[PDB]
Scaffold this active site. Structure first.
Site, PDB file in Angstrom:
ATOM      1  N   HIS A 190      -0.728  -1.625 -12.276  1.00 56.31           N
ATOM      2  CA  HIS A 190      -1.040  -0.574 -11.153  1.00 56.31           C
ATOM      3  C   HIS A 190      -0.824  -1.520 -10.012  1.00 56.31           C
ATOM      4  O   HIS A 190      -0.568  -2.686 -10.050  1.00 56.31           O
ATOM      5  CB  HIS A 190      -2.312   0.150 -11.101  1.00 56.31           C
ATOM      6  CG  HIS A 190      -3.506  -0.509 -11.065  1.00 56.31           C
ATOM      7  ND1 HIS A 190      -4.078  -0.910 -12.053  1.00 56.31           N
ATOM      8  CD2 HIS A 190      -4.414  -1.021 -10.062  1.00 56.31           C
ATOM      9  CE1 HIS A 190      -5.151  -1.818 -11.672  1.00 56.31           C
ATOM     10  NE2 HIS A 190      -5.427  -1.529 -10.266  1.00 56.31           N
ATOM     11  N   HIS A 224      -8.692   5.086 -12.199  1.00 57.66           N
ATOM     12  CA  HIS A 224      -9.033   3.789 -11.552  1.00 57.66           C
ATOM     13  C   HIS A 224      -8.059   3.890 -10.213  1.00 57.66           C
ATOM     14  O   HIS A 224      -8.572   3.515  -9.207  1.00 57.66           O
ATOM     15  CB  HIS A 224      -8.888   2.576 -12.206  1.00 57.66           C
ATOM     16  CG  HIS A 224      -8.645   1.360 -11.460  1.00 57.66           C
ATOM     17  ND1 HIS A 224      -9.800   0.697 -10.973  1.00 57.66           N
ATOM     18  CD2 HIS A 224      -7.865   0.491 -11.192  1.00 57.66           C
ATOM     19  CE1 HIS A 224      -9.530  -0.343 -10.181  1.00 57.66           C
ATOM     20  NE2 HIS A 224      -8.213  -0.393 -10.367  1.00 57.66           N
ATOM     21  N   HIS A 270      -2.906  -2.637  -7.587  1.00 56.81           N
ATOM     22  CA  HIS A 270      -3.963  -3.695  -7.303  1.00 56.81           C
ATOM     23  C   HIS A 270      -3.592  -5.362  -7.138  1.00 56.81           C
ATOM     24  O   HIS A 270      -2.712  -5.647  -8.086  1.00 56.81           O
ATOM     25  CB  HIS A 270      -5.164  -3.320  -7.594  1.00 56.81           C
ATOM     26  CG  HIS A 270      -5.957  -2.148  -6.877  1.00 56.81           C
ATOM     27  ND1 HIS A 270      -6.666  -1.478  -7.757  1.00 56.81           N
ATOM     28  CD2 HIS A 270      -5.884  -1.698  -5.889  1.00 56.81           C
ATOM     29  CE1 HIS A 270      -7.139  -0.507  -6.643  1.00 56.81           C
ATOM     30  NE2 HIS A 270      -6.426  -0.580  -5.666  1.00 56.81           N
ATOM     31  N   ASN A 303     -15.320  -1.129  -7.790  1.00 58.97           N
ATOM     32  CA  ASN A 303     -14.362  -0.691  -7.054  1.00 58.97           C
ATOM     33  C   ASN A 303     -13.653   0.526  -7.528  1.00 58.97           C
ATOM     34  O   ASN A 303     -12.777   0.452  -8.505  1.00 58.97           O
ATOM     35  CB  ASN A 303     -13.266  -1.645  -6.878  1.00 58.97           C
ATOM     36  CG  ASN A 303     -12.115  -1.499  -5.979  1.00 58.97           C
ATOM     37  OD1 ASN A 303     -12.085  -0.337  -4.961  1.00 58.97           O
ATOM     38  ND2 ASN A 303     -10.809  -1.733  -6.240  1.00 58.97           N
ATOM     39  N   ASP A 332      -5.046  -7.676  -8.518  1.00 58.06           N
ATOM     40  CA  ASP A 332      -5.144  -8.171 -10.062  1.00 58.06           C
ATOM     41  C   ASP A 332      -4.216  -7.921 -10.970  1.00 58.06           C
ATOM     42  O   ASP A 332      -3.931  -8.288 -12.077  1.00 58.06           O
ATOM     43  CB  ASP A 332      -6.517  -7.861 -10.756  1.00 58.06           C
ATOM     44  CG  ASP A 332      -6.743  -6.414 -10.730  1.00 58.06           C
ATOM     45  OD1 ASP A 332      -6.357  -5.576  -9.908  1.00 58.06           O
ATOM     46  OD2 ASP A 332      -7.317  -5.844 -11.551  1.00 58.06           O
TER      47      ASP A 332
HETATM   48  N1  LIG Z   1      -7.420  -3.395   3.101  1.00 55.94           N
HETATM   49  C1  LIG Z   1      -7.691  -2.598   2.138  1.00 55.94           C
HETATM   50  C2  LIG Z   1      -8.022  -3.117   1.170  1.00 55.94           C
HETATM   51  O1  LIG Z   1      -7.255  -2.933  -0.066  1.00 55.94           O
HETATM   52  C3  LIG Z   1      -7.307  -3.340  -1.488  1.00 55.94           C
HETATM   53  C4  LIG Z   1      -7.420  -2.920  -2.428  1.00 55.94           C
HETATM   54  C5  LIG Z   1      -7.884  -3.338  -3.706  1.00 55.94           C
HETATM   55  C6  LIG Z   1      -8.050  -4.464  -3.757  1.00 55.94           C
HETATM   56  C7  LIG Z   1      -8.489  -4.887  -5.250  1.00 55.94           C
HETATM   57  C8  LIG Z   1      -9.565  -5.045  -6.027  1.00 55.94           C
HETATM   58  N2  LIG Z   1      -9.227  -5.773  -7.215  1.00 55.94           N
HETATM   59  C9  LIG Z   1     -10.444  -5.575  -8.075  1.00 55.94           C
HETATM   60  C10 LIG Z   1     -11.530  -6.804  -8.173  1.00 55.94           C
HETATM   61  C11 LIG Z   1     -12.282  -6.642  -9.080  1.00 55.94           C
HETATM   62  C12 LIG Z   1     -12.372  -5.560 -10.138  1.00 55.94           C
HETATM   63  C13 LIG Z   1     -11.513  -4.678 -10.229  1.00 55.94           C
HETATM   64  C14 LIG Z   1     -11.713  -3.602 -11.130  1.00 55.94           C
HETATM   65  O2  LIG Z   1     -10.578  -3.159 -11.878  1.00 55.94           O
HETATM   66  O3  LIG Z   1     -12.822  -3.010 -11.161  1.00 55.94           O
HETATM   67  C15 LIG Z   1     -10.345  -4.796  -9.080  1.00 55.94           C
HETATM   68  C16 LIG Z   1      -9.620  -3.253  -8.913  1.00 55.94           C
HETATM   69  O4  LIG Z   1      -8.422  -3.627  -9.710  1.00 55.94           O
HETATM   70  O5  LIG Z   1     -10.020  -2.523  -8.689  1.00 55.94           O
HETATM   71  N3  LIG Z   1      -8.237  -6.282  -6.950  1.00 55.94           N
HETATM   72  N4  LIG Z   1      -7.574  -5.927  -5.974  1.00 55.94           N
HETATM   73  C17 LIG Z   1      -7.842  -5.278  -2.688  1.00 55.94           C
HETATM   74  C18 LIG Z   1      -7.616  -4.798  -1.589  1.00 55.94           C
HETATM   75 ZN   LIG Z   2      -7.546  -2.034  -9.635  1.00 60.97          ZN
HETATM   76 ZN   LIG Z   3      -9.037  -4.271 -11.984  1.00 57.57          ZN
END
Ligand SMILES: NCCOc1ccc(-c2cn(-c3cccc(C(=O)O)c3C(=O)O)nn2)cc1
Ligand SMILES: [Zn+2]
Ligand SMILES: [Zn+2]
Length: 231
Positions: free
Chosen positions: A83, A148, A85, A179, A87
């Site tokens: 997806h 998710h 994001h 998140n 990660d």
């Molecule tokens: N300006 C808006 C910001 O937009 C964003 C949206 C998503 C992310 C993001 C979450 N991440 C996560 C970090 C820790 C845990 C998780 C999880 O799987 O629960 C995630 C994620 O994949 O959501 N990785 N990247 C980072 C920024």
């Molecule tokens: Zn994610």
């Molecule tokens: Zn994640």
């Protein structure tokens, strides 16, 4: 033993053999001031390696390419972000740099582009309507519906009965949502029961973050997401 989070710098990548020809990669990042696990998959494909997801960023991912070669010595030729994001696509740039052909559902490329995250080059047609499944080398790619994220895919390795659910699935240590900014909370339990229906075979179940389990990870995830829904 499978690695836990506090053993891995924000830069060291561990490889965890899960079967002949199947490893998971484990990296760590900082986010919300805090330090988090992240899993991805490595699947041998005859002579080459199929990568599932980045190691969460360009540093980690250039690093992840360096374990693989050090430890496995086979070339990573294709990779799939499950997806949009960071990660998952964090370090697609890198992979393409090294010659890796990157891939992602068209839903994932668009939301990545909309998001300012890196964009896989190729598009993984045939995964648009919920329940869509396609074959990609040594594994199957499934679109269980919004969860998710609305684009999340999940990966299955028949050869070892490994089901990689990524961030649509939580580890057991994780009792509370975390998140859901991009989550479809209403559809997530459903999207998930499919994963249960369409891959009952799976002995090993990897989540996006944390310790692999069996299929009870699914039921645990539903429990979490529902709890979350009711406040
Ligand atoms: N300006 C808006 C910001 O937009 C964003 C949206 C998503 C992310 C993001 C979450 N991440 C996560 C970090 C820790 C845990 C998780 C999880 O799987 O629960 C995630 C994620 O994949 O959501 N990785 N990247 C980072 C920024
Ligand atoms: Zn994610
Ligand atoms: Zn994640």
């Amino acid at each position: 033993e499978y690695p836990t989070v506090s053993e891995i710098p924000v830069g060291e990548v561990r490889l965890y053999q899960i079967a002949d020809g199947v490893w998971s990669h484990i990296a760590t990042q900082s986010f919300d001031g805090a330090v988090y696990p992240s899993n991805g998959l490595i699947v041998r494909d005859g002579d080459e390696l199929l990568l599932i997801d980045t190691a969460w960023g360009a540093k980690n991912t250039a690093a992840l390419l360096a374990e693989i070669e050090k430890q496995i010595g086979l070339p990573v030729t294709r990779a799939v972000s499950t997806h949009f994001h960071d990660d998952r696509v964090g370090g697609v740039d890198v992979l393409r740099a090294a010659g890796v052909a990157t891939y992602a559902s068209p839903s994932t490329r668009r939301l990545a582009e909309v998001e300012g995250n890196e964009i896989p080059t190729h598009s993984l047609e045939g995964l648009s309507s919920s329940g869509d499944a396609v074959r990609f080398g040594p594994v199957e790619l499934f679109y269980p519906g919004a969860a998710h994220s609305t684009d999340n895919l999940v990966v299955y390795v028949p050869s070892a009965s490994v089901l990689y659910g990524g961030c649509a699935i939580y580890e057991l240590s994780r009792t509370s949502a975390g998140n859901v900014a991009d989550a479809d909370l209403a559809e997530w339990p459903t999207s998930i029961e499919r994963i249960q229906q369409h891959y009952p075979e799976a002995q090993f179940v990897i989540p996006g973050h944390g310790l692999p389990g069996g299929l009870d990870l699914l039921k645990h995830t539903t429990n979490v997401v529902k709890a979350h829904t009711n406040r």
